[model samples]
Target chain A: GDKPRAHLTVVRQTPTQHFKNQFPALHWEHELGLAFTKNRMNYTNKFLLIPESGDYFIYSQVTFRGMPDSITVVITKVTDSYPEPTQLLMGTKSVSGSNWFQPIYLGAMFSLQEGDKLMVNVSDISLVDYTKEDKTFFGAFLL
Target chain B: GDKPRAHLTVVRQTPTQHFKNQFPALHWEHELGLAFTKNRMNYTNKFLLIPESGDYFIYSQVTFRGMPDSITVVITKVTDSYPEPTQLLMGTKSVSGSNWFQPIYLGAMFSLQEGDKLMVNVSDISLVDYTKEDKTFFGAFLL
Candidate 1:
């Protein structure tokens, strides 16, 4: 029960300039309501810091609301030895409709080193639905 | 930790007739490439056999490349006394494009019993991309 673990829920974002080459990372509510970081897991600066070196199961789900047809989510790991982040998993979907609510879920297991940081990136930050913790969330636990 | 865990990757599927009452369960390569079964977890006859009773995290992703333009995936659990499988998680996506690659992911935590069987079923078997291990995969770990 002392293993590292955390669950994060979506929060409303302040508008930021969209980039052509890089997608924006989504911030989370990590310690309120159904979200939490426990047993040495810590969240800061939109990233979850790895507390120990081991295989951790990483996961994220996003609910997007808009008139657009497609949605995308990417989970990345940042290591000190590398300049660029390593993309661990990605989930993308598109549908043809005027108004729609799309949910994208992604998760995987990976060997992470201590000091490694993880974050969730979205294709468009404005379309994410932040009203409920159950609708969109992120979390990880040591295996 | 002595826990139940397994990762399975998509393999080349043999052509089978589609059914209106049932979707086909995917067969996976459980011990090659990025896939493995460990700590009493076992794969048999297109199903992951649960060796212990506990809450577990389950996940799956599929890359679709055909002209279906929409995709659906289901992760389900079955017990011996039950004649029907219980659907635990589902992910679906539709896009307006031609010759595009789309990935659909689904995951959640569920209480499973020992001897329960887990499988991944898709809307269309032919649309799944099986060329890479990371692109299409299935996995679960006990809590």
Candidate 2:
């Protein structure tokens, strides 16, 4: 049997940084940085660009500790077809704790075009747990 | 140009349930049940059966509010190739909060065989929030 296999995917975990803003796209070789790429999928700067667009299972998880007044995690997509980036998915939660941590995981399948770029954004980068590779991560795969 | 495509994958969220068991497998069609299957991949009861032998990216997320002593989440694999079930991945967190919520997200890539079964398990089923689809999810895809 001859079956088609499209193995285009990228998985990246953020490294520890002392800042407060949108998550910086992850690279490699840092204390907690992780990257996995196959086929032609590419991760550059802070975006994962699609190689052969079809439908993709895109996802991200943001882990954090402490009680901010509020928090939001956004997955955005950029393409030449559009002038502005589009919001693919969003997850928001109100935080109030003595000393506890939480993780927000968001994922879905959506039609995408070749060259479309995807990235993760958060309300506060300082809340992200970058000291651990598994705590905060982002990924997408062709379906 | 020719391309090879990957096979079966399913991602499902919570729905309403009235079960008493501490460990229960989620069923379909209650609240926000989202499922996807490709290349003859099948999902039955609580297990996602592999369609081919290859490395796969498997993941799950469980979200809850308030604390009830402790919580444990496990992703297990069952195969006829093995004598008994094997624990592929596990995440457990002890909870102590007056009024707070937490989400546990775990994922990794591993070699899998056809006819292999994968599912998520937790210590306390009642603590999971099934109302929001993105808040808690279980899914995997061939890499």
Candidate 3:
């Protein structure tokens, strides 16, 4: 309790134009419904900015809009020290004509620097579903 | 935030014996590399022992070696009161190709009791990758 933590749920999103080889990042609803930011955790431009430096538990759940499809969920970190986004946690799975209904969840702990910003990127933005608040979400908590 | 937490990473694992149709479970390096147990959390017998009862965030990422290998990752919980292992989170996907690399991540929040034990089970253990510490991992923390 009293630690920096946040839970961001999905909101309506406009598909980002795909770059040559880069996955599109998904933005979130930082507050409202089941989403929230507390103890100084911040959310901006598809990044959940860390307030203090320490080991933090980061997590995200992505629900694909289309199935019979391959999906990759990635948690990327960007810092002032580095110009490129560092890959933190990533999960990729492929299935088509699928009958199962569930979201892909990714999570782990990483030592982070203060002001480090984290974002969730997917293999295809067009396949992302943003209709539900809980089904697709992102969050982190300081340990 | 003095709560129970632990992160376990992939390591050399002994093949598990199957009784009936149970999938083989994985053990992890709990204290080495980026893994750690703190605030009364303990890792033993491939199970993360919960020190206190509360809502917790449980997660795991399984990196498989072979592509087009149908994989299933399951997180099971066993308690003193329940003799059977309860499947908490599961993700099953099939994919194959000449090249590609990524792991499958699964996570969720659940209410747990003191002394409850948690373990990660996979459909096939032979395809797991234990090379990098951060690539394949398991972890949990009390909320």
Candidate 4:
């Protein structure tokens, strides 16, 4: 049965494509994964990418106001040849439902070939809330 | 002819199992060459990692208090397989004493295979305060 053909993720708006830093700079790792919300932290930073190679369905609408933390999602495959990281996809840790908008759906599987570059990550524990600003807003297309 | 096959890695863990929320995501910038720490604001928290191709030794120890601000080691590969990034290794940033944990001898074009992954970063900004009651505690480990 062949019924699964819909992979079109074309988002554009990169101030040089944000998010890309994490090493011990901990303190709640402030920045370098971009794409965030709850009132703009790295707001409106989009990158709905896809060069070739299929399967994807990542839709997001986050807004959690307190208590109930657990957010983790990841998918990686960006190459030019080898710098590190061949392929790794992970997720588990989502708990925060109540106090406002919360719409999430996940199911992303990968296996591409052709100048691959796919990245998606989301994390929380209220991520060391600065006050009550817990935010998360994402985007991905293809199914 | 086959005693040189001990540098194989592909470990992924840090809130991941099935799109629970998303975290622990890496690309290692094409294979193993991403530089940072040109004092990046005194590397606020401290992060500089790179060593995968063969023989690595820099467990942890980067000094910076007054400034002379160091820590910037770069490497780049993954020329073409999917999207962007080609080859670019630039260095200049190393701190810590006593040979810094001895184990910095990477040759043969910086070995890396078996599904590589490396993207350790830090900007050296400032104001760091750990928890559990701070005791020189900053965590991260992935052999």
Candidate 5:
């Protein structure tokens, strides 16, 4: 019973970008190769559709190149089982600098259900850099 | 017959402080015990030495207050096989906020070595908060 066996992965990838835009479902055009899509999880649409009910560790980061009035990034989950989209985690850092850059990161563990779609959202998309892979990204993992 | 599995983890931890020096190899005195370190994997002074050869997901975050002239946070890797330490990832932001708080986060995946040492260096350490658990942290995990 302790033999090594092969298995399949649902959403085995991390989504990243380096440009400015509001990410509805993330529009995952850039990837770190580690990101692979399976049946329930779709990378093309930039959303992780939960295949099973369990606990998950969700995390995301947004880096800004210039100061904006206010900056907010949220990790949200929408389920057919719920009436409204619920925010799992959020990072909001007020910027009063003109020529400064700042990054906000948020991560936490949450219980998810089958068909729950997780996505990332930001307040101001124009203040971020979308040219480099390492500057901004979003991801989650089953706990 | 295959053998049973034996191990796990990610994310390095670092403490907060106010200092006026630059760190080529960070001095990590605070940790959250999130990293899975083996015999060759080590964290001393302020560096996390790699034990096995593989791609790793690394990340770091710093919180600031009252604003600073400038801030630069970098994740560096030093390998015995290389002459100079390589800059794997970095975040540079200008700070002009008064009586406000800010945070900088940087993270990405990179190929690492068995003897490679990873560390976080900041432009000014004093702007970081060590009193809270989430204000500042450094961590890495095998991808």
Candidate 6:
């Protein structure tokens, strides 16, 4: 039999820098933008999800500059008005020190509910002066 | 300049349980069907993504019961026909073993092109012996 598959279409796009002003809670302190800057810290301004619910293979390659000595990534449900059942999706600790300008990998079996959402987060848990740039992340969906 | 940003949308989901009986790919293997499966593992039957081309953050999690040591989770991508490039997104060698199950995370930055797919996986992984329940995983769009 053929492999089960699905298609993802870009419904929209918003400027990365503008997301902060548009949504106050989504704001972050960063000097760099998705394009480029000397500060070298930036994040994409956008959102995505599947059309329906089923099984899927997800692949994400994250890239960033000014990699702190340690960091934490979290995926939780969307809790806008109130708190939701905060479930931990995946987390990885850093084994490197200094600025590691590279993309990292996270692997695990994730089964989401109909409205469940995922996020990639970075927390500055380093001892060095790692002024977090909070940017440079990417992802793709596959069948 | 304001904070850097990008655009993203929900990845369309494939709604079909055919993979449950048709395909050879491993189905969510928890104690009970993801529907009734308690605590341990609960995976959904859906895959999602951002509709456009931009950098984004992604993450996922699963629950499991009974473990002796560290477990392994893998996120992979497949293209065209499978069996190859078909690329390997990320792999984890050491995941702390647990019964009730907290959550771990993996974070980084990467750009996803159009027509790409994602896979969340686990290896050297087994559920409670005879339990065929599906494990639920969750993900979301970073605002």
DockQ of 1: 0.33
RMSD of 5: 7.9
Stretches of candidate 6 off by over 4 Å are: A1-46, A67-69, A79-82, A95-99, A124-137, A140-143, B1-29, B32-143
- Cα lDDT of model 4 by residue, A1-143, tens digit: 12122111212212223345421111121222322212112212122334444553333222222323554445444576788644354545445323222312233445554345444444542332222111222333322
The residue-by-residue lDDT of candidate 2 on A1-143, one tens digit each, is 22212212223345556565544543322112354665777666677778875767787777766746666677788889879777655566657538778777776555578788877777766566666656677777665
TM-score of 1: 0.74
Best by DockQ: 1
TM-score of each: 0.74, 0.60, 0.70, 0.20, 0.63, 0.32
Query: Taking chain A of candidate 3, what TM-score results?
Result: 0.91
For model 1 chain B, the run of ten residues with the poorest summed lDDT: B92-101
**Model 6: DockQ score:** 0.06
User: Whose lDDT is greatest here?
Assistant: 1
Residue-level error in angstroms, candidate 1, position B120:
2.6
lDDT of 1 at B119: 95
By TM-score, the candidates rank as 1, 3, 5, 2, 6, 4
Q: Evaluated with TM-score, which candidate comes out highest?
A: 1
lDDT of 1 at A79: 86
Local distance difference test, candidate 5: 0.60
Docking class of 4: incorrect
Each model's lDDT: 0.85, 0.63, 0.83, 0.28, 0.60, 0.34
> How do the candidates rank by DockQ, highest first?
1, 3, 5, 2, 6, 4
lDDT of 3 by residue, A1-143 (tens): 57899999988778666587888788889889999999989898798988898779888888876543467788888989979878777677655343454477877887788899999888877677888896899999987
lDDT of 1 by residue, A1-143 (tens): 58999999998877887567577888999999999999999999789999899778888888989854557788888989989887667676655556778787778887688899999998889899988989999999888
Write candidate 2's Cα lDDT for B12-73 as tens digits.
44543765654555543211323355455677777787878888777776766554667777
Instruction: Quote the TM-score that chain A achieves in each candidate.
Output: 0.94, 0.76, 0.91, 0.23, 0.73, 0.43
Model 6 C-alpha lDDT per residue in residues B1-143, reported as the tens digit of each score: 11112111112223444443322222332222222222211233332333444554544443333433544444444444456633334434443413333223343445654334455554423431222111234332322
- Candidate 1 Cα misplacement greater than 4 A, ranges: A18-20, A67-69, A131-134, B11-22, B29-34, B49-57, B63-117, B131-135
Name the 10 consecutive residues with the lowest summed lDDT in model 5 chain B: B1-10
Candidate 2, B48: how far from true, in Å? 0.5
> Who is ahead in DockQ, 1 or 2?
1
